[PDB]
């Protein structure tokens, strides 16, 4: 999917994540034998409807909260 604002992952440099245009967020892992995202988000009601413009990390590895801001007026930490 068209990933928008694929930011880092605190204490996971190689486990890069990214919000998409579809409304889902994708988590890649270069060291998981798949450059394609290993942790994809389904496009159900739990995720976002409108495009996810800003996925971003909040807190260290203890509280690895990944807020994925979308254009729906709905975000997902």
């Amino acid at each position: 999917s068209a990933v928008m604002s694929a930011t880092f992952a605190k204490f996971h440099p190689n486990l890069v994540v990214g919000g998409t245009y579809s409304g889902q967020i994708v988590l890649w892992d270069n060291r998981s034998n798949k450059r394609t995202p290993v942790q994809r988000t389904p496009l159900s009601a739990a995720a976002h409807t409108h495009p996810v413009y800003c996925v971003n990390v909040v807190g260290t590895q203890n509280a690895h909260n990944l807020i994925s801001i979308s254009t729906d007026g709905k975000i997902c930490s």
Binding site: S22, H50, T71
Partner: protein, 66 residues
């Protein structure tokens, strides 16, 4: 239908240009809520509710065909 050697035909979702128009409707309504007719608002409500499910179907078609 697909145009290549062997005359194959692939899968498809009927929401390909709707994603752009839905973005236009959402920006034109939250930005200022211009003099847009209610028919367009009905199209936005009938297609934005399908938009994540529609692109998920697009994901199913793209990954299935890939």
């Amino acid at each position: 239908v697909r145009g290549r050697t062997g005359n194959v035909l692939k899968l498809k979702v009927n929401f390909l240009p709707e994603i752009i128009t839905l973005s236009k409707e959402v920006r034109n309504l939250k930005w200022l809520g211009f003099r847009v007719p209610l028919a367009i608002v009905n199209k936005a409500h009938q297609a934005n509710q399908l938009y994540p499910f529609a692109i998920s179907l697009i994901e199913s078609v793209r990954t299935y065909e890939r």
